Amino acid sequence: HATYGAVPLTHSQVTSVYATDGGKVDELGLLELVEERIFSWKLNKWEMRIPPNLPNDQKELIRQEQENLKQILSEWRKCFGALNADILQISSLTGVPKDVVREKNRTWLQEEVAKLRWMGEVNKAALLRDAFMRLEAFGSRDFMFMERLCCIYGLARQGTFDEAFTNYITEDPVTNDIFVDERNPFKELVAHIVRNYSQIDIIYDFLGFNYSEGYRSSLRRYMEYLQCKTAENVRASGRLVTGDKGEHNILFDYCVSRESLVSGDSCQGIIDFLYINGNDVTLIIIASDNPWLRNRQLPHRRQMEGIARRVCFVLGIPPSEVRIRNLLLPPTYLDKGSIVRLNDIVFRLSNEQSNLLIPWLTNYNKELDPKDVDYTALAKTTNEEEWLTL
Amino acid sequence: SHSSAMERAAITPTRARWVEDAFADQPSVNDIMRTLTEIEQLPFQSTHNTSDESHITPYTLGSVAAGVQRLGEHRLRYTLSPWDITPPEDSVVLKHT
Amino acid sequence: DASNNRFFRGYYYGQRELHQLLGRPHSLEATNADGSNDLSTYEANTSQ
Amino acid sequence: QRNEAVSSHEAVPQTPLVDLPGVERRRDLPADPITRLFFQHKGDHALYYGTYDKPSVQDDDRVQIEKRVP
Amino acid sequence: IFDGPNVGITPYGGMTRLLARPETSLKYPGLAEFVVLTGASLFAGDALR
Amino acid sequence: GGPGSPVRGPRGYTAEWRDLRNPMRPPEFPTPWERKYRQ
Amino acid sequence: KLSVLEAAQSGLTDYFCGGLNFEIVGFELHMAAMLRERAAAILERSGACAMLLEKADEREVNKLLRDASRYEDRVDDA
Amino acid sequence: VNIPETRQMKFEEQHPLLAGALRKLEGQPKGFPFWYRKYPTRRHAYEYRFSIPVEMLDGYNDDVKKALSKGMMSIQEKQFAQEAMYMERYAEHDFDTTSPAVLAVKRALKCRVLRNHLLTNPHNNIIKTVLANTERKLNHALRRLRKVDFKKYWEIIRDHDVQDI
Amino acid sequence: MHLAGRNGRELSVRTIQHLFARTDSFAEALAVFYTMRRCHVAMNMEAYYSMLYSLQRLEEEGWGQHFRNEYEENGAPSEQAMDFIVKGISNALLPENKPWLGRVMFQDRNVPDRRYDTRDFDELDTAWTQRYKSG
Amino acid sequence: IYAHALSQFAVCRQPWNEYIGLLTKQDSTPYHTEPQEKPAYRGRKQG
Amino acid sequence: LRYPPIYFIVKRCTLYFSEWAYAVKHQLLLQSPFALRAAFGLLQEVRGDGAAENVMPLAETLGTEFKYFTRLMRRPDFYRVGVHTDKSVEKWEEIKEERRHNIHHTHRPTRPLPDFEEVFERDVEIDGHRFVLRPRWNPRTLQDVDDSDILRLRAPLTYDMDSTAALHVPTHCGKASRLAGMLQDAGGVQVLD
Amino acid sequence: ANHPNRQSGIQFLTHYNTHQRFRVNKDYIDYMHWGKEQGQARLPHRHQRVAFDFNDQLHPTRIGYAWFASQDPTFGHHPDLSSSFDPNYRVFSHPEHWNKMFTKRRPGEGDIDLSVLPSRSLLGPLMAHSDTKGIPYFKVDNRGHSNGRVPGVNAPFFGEFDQKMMQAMSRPLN
Amino acid sequence: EKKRIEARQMMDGRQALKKKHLDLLREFHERQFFFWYERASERLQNMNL
Amino acid sequence: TPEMVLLFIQACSNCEEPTAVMLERSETLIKRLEAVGSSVDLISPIYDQFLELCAHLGAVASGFSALKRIVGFGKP
16 A cells, blocks of 8 residues: 555656566466456555655646546446456357357357257347357457556556555465465566556557646657657757758747647647658647637648748748648547558658557557547638637 | 519420420430530521520629729729829919818 | 525525635526536636 | 337447538527527627626627616 | 439439429420439429429 | 435446347247237 | 428528538448448458458458448438 | 836837837838837827827927927826826736726826815815715725735835825 | 829739839838828728738848858757747737738738749739639 | 539529519509608507 | 730520530530439339329339439449539638648548549540530540449349348338337247248 | 606616616606607607517618629618618707706707717818728728628528518427 | 536637737727828828918 | 946946856846836946946857847947
8 A cells, every 4th residue: 555655656767666577478468367356356445545745736636647547447347347248158158168269250150150049049049149249349358458558557657556466365266275375467567568668658648648738748759759760860959859961850849739828829820849851841739628729729821821931931941842731639648540640741751660660559549539539620710700709 | 463474484485395306205315415416516597596585694793883893992092083183284382271 | 505405505695605705707697506607717727 | 218229229339430520519590680689699609708797799789688776 | 403413323302203294294395304414403483384 | 205315326338238139139038028018 | 280391591591401411421421432442451451241260350341341331321311 | 297118118129120110210201100009099199189199290390299299288188198107007908998906096096186176176066976986986996906916006005105095 | 103093093902912022121111102102092901901011021031031041050940940930020010820910801911921923923813814714 | 613504594583573563553643642640659648 | 915905704695506405415514424324214214104104103203213322322423523513612722721731631531531633624625515624423424334334223122232221211201210119019030040 | 657757657678777767867758859750758769679569670780782682683672771770879858968947948048968969060071071081991990790790791691581580589399 | 527627618718719809909909090190190281281 | 227227237347256146137137127118318328337247257149139139229
């Protein structure tokens, strides 16, 4: 539990505290074991988890993060239980071993339902069919791999749940022998996470688990890392990361849209990042959570023309070919659809090196929620409604 | 209080005869196209090439004065009229009213 | 409280003074049951 | 409601699909701009809308009902 | 206005039966074909006729 | 039991999704329900 | 005694009753077509409703085909 | 009464090209109002009559300049000029005509004028009543300004060392 | 312009906008405005806004050349140069970020800010002629 | 774009208010006369 | 030009048979050829011999129209090019600007985006007709179509061909909202291999 | 109420701050000359009424035809569209504007204010005569119409006219 | 909490609209001053004679 | 007052060892008083003494910035 001296670890020190190296780590097996232990937990295991001596200003944020993680785990618990119930029912009906039920084919389903219907148990056949359909729908051992890994990483980052998975009394039902288990699957799991997923913090913020001004600094660091990898010379002075090479590889962090939009001086061309590749300029803007201001988030066409003209004046780029483009990013998180277009269009990153630089891109399958689908659909406003609406 | 001329119609008898000569009893789109092409080369002097009162599509403005007024919205109008812009041939000394 | 008690929903003395103290924009035929048209600035800006 | 739900029930929990930018907005009620007591102001001007005590400037062609005060 | 083919689809709505009525083909032969192909508009006067 | 009584209180598919079945599919147990009562 | 049916336009449009919204119909048909073409591409990649020996490929093909069929069902319902 | 020169300094800082244009065109007639940003409102130009800015009277004769100078303003015009000068020094922005500070300074100046008029001729019961009402409104405005800020209080209440209003 | 006024033909808004866009210096623009006033032309808010846009773009070009000098001398743009690139002139008349000020008859007029060559002016006329000949 | 062929027909709505105002009227006078003021309800006690 | 030009439009108070025929041919060429053939086939199928009895009733008319519509909407000619031809000039300008200035709406858009040049071909000549803008139909002309497609369109609707059930308008009005109830009352669907 | 000074009544159908017309102090009834077109003198004016009959025209919309091209070409100006209509248009009243009770009510005296009625003197236009054009030419107004877009005034008008409030007074069933 | 965040977003929108209203009033005042200068110029010209 | 700021600048310029704090104090005093704009034509000696202090310190950037600012304001 959170006793005196407990401090919420950060990303720099979590990798240091978890540095044991293992030759072979069952990435999915340890995740399943830790998830089933979390499910076997009780609701009172979350009480003494907030570190004692911290200011209330950040203590509220810590409690909010812990409550979010608890709610996510509780939400996933019932889905996992229903999935296991379906697997057990299918195994009971068919006789097929439970382990290999997970990866059975629709042709196997066809012959099983056919033989059940021939035997006359039409109810059993239909039940098996629907159970197999839903099991096929939600049967991946990596159904939400990044989500589960980031939940485990956040649980470790809280720096209080490490000792929970220890000193547990368990008995073998076949053997009837009772022994106290001292093994800690959480330790080896988080060690594997910090060994493999170097950008686990970036993934954690992209998934939207960083409520305290997250997803912005992580995005900036991701862009800086991508620029450094795709280039060879870099000078980072404060908010300007530029390449001294002849090609104008320039990244500029203008301001924070979320704060600047509400601070004052109501404008329309408030951006977040400005990236020039020497031939094209891209304005990357994180959409505001306020729908009324999201309409004016995008810069005007006149402002786009002015930006192009000013870039031509300063950088010396000929105005004959200047591709100035806008990119919108979801406000609360970052989805795979936006990540791929950011990698492909904003930079010169190709597919062959995309997986080289981003090993977790294949496992990043987050999709926009129905509440966040319309984050880019902005209703047009006529010139005579300037007084009335935004 | 209803006249056959005052009803809004587009199948006026001349157009009805045109349709019955260009579409009726023609069970092929290719045949219809051939008939239309044949009708294309009818000279204006041909008796079969009958005329009809063509409805004129309405103009945007409808009046020359209205057109000039609309066009004047995009111009800067001088303080003085063109005939009094020029200085007079007789010497006039400006003074208070 | 005002949520499940009729006597606490008295406007002119039960709730008008509280709304004046807390800064909530208050009206007689208010949208909320207590008598406040909208939340105060602190309530809107800060979580509880 | 329960009968309709069970009738439309599916063995698989189907996920929502992406639709057009909007087909769910509350349509403004019809009105005649020419012959009207008041203009049917659309809901997109909720920012411009005021309150009963301090109304905004609108329907200036008509007289304004002053609140009764003792 | 039927205006079916210009959008790339067959006209839909049931007006084809009214166009193919024997009364219509008797009063104005070829009108059904003209309307379905050219997508012309029939007015109140035309419907009265 | 009215409103004066104290309150009763309050990704995938849940546990109560599995038992629900479409009435189009045959029932698990063919209880001879009266048609009038079924309607 | 009498059920009148009409259109209440505020002067914005002059139509009485337009057809089925061809914009939304084309949008959903295009979405279904894109889903079907992506499913066909992944199916031929796996070969080099549908049933495939590979479990993940079969699952994603089934999901894409199901979503495309849902779009087609929406068009049919309209 | 004269305008504070902070306005000129701010205008020169904000708009360098316009300020340099005015400085180089000093003494020369000008056909374009460069000072439009310097004078957002009519009440912000109280040096000359009828809200005429100083820069406009450039290519005109000294007789017209003298006729429009401060020495030819009526009593009401002088009162309004002093009121505007005091209000612009407390207004949060150019259009600030509703804040308690500007309301209080306007009401205080009006009360001073009413008191002087009553000292001259006291037979106006209407003036007595309107002075009482204006005093009440000024008291209410100051009571409202108290909670929003008190630095303005320690700036304004040192006028004649009232400290007891 | 005296001949134009005598003949009675009225100068078009786009012609005036390009006339003020071709100017080089503030003194030149002031001379043009004085000449237009002397030629008995009633000034309009569109003309005033064209003059204001010309002033703004003159200062914009000056700052652009100033920052071009530093970019050439250093080999890398500066933070102030980037901020100017983003937000235009600091506190400029008719700011570009808010396009609801430079509007006349509910139509924005930002033509007299960028330099126009002999082709850019001609493109609009060629487009209008092509539209007339086609549709 | 597509209205080029449609505008060839150019069938438009015919006037109706003019027809109504210019058709023969049962009550038509050779010279129009302004109707006289009708009595109004002056008040409760007046009538 | 040696003298200033002045632009007039010439409108004919009376049209001729040749001019009307030219307008009709222009409209026919402008619209889709495959759609024209399908519409002609649908009309002749509905009309039949032309007798007062051989004309299909309203229910059969709606059924055949639904059959043709379902058979034709699967073609890319409808949902890729045809549906975008009715957009206004303002809408097209907005689409052009949005595509030219937006990344998320172009590279991997969650919502499909029309392409003006991909749906319209510019300045085409077809047997003496000049089209400043003509929609880009896959069967460009009427001579590039096949009669086998028309025969299959006129063939009766079957679930094997297009996986679409037949339409019966009155029974769909009646029992569509109660089909599940009637099936439950019957006892469910019997599945026989 | 037979008490003098209370003949105004208790009319609630006014827009004043109190329902007691004799107690309100905004507008004062001129019983001797008012009521020419509104019946009694105590009733609200035609341009200040909030109650409408079945066979009486409503308040005309102020526009301050061009937009009826799509409609019937012979349709003249809409009777419900007026170019000069002021809702709070003060009318001249002797008791409030031309008051003579202080004097002996002689023909030559009486306290009069000229703000009620626009000046008819030729002095007006002569002093307010300028070589430059007027406000509509100078385009000093940026608000335009109070409402964003009016199909009758700002934009072209489509659809069909609706004189009686039928579509504008209806309840959605969906 | 959900209602609170909704109200906060609404208040942010209203504040932005108020700032835009202030900007539009500034533009209107500048236009009025521009018109006044044109009108007042000729009167001073007449007063100069 | 202009006299007050001029006297302070004279003291901190003609004194000894005005290494670091006094330059920044003079800068903030100038940036605070210029906003009020009490001195407009009498600030030429103030800027002359500021330039003398910059000469004593050796800094060239601050002196050139002050010279550019005053020449923009209009001081010959």
